[PDB]
């Protein structure tokens, strides 16, 4: 089984890019990270910085989670991020991805010893 914060690097890191380049990003990356295996995954955020900056936010801003937990934390500052989203023609094993980059604070839940990500909350 994948640890969770394989899982998290694995559906949320691509330090390789400042940004998404083209509109085709979400549909190569959604596919290399296999997140199209078996279904399509409908959401998925990318964070563009480096997997060291996206662990330190673990030591930054506590804020509560969307359900209610208090391990998720923002980051003071903002991030180069890519969301992908499915759009309305996405069918597996088809899928079809609108892919929109912003640079935006991230929200993380974190856990373990290291304290790291473990899930992607949300960008503001
Ligand atoms: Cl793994
Ligand atoms: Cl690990
Ligand atoms: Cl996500």
Redesign the pocket.
């Known amino acids: 089984k ?2 969770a914060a ?2 998290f690097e ?1 559906q949320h890191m691509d330090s390789s890019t400042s940004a998404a380049s083209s509109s085709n990003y979400c549909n190569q990356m959604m596919k290399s990270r296999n997140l199209t295996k078996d279904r399509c995954k409908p959401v998925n955020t990318f964070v563009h910085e480096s997997l060291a900056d996206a662990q330190a936010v673990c030591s930054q801003k506590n804020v509560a989670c969307k359900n209610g937990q208090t391990n998720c934390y923002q980051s003071y500052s903002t991030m180069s991020i890519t969301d992908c989203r499915e759009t309305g023609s996405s069918k597996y094993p088809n899928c079809a991805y609108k892919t929109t980059q912003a640079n935006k604070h991230i929200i993380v839940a974190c856990e373990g010893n290291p304290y790291v990500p473990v899930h992607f909350d949300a960008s503001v």
């Open positions: 994948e640890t394989a899982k694995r």
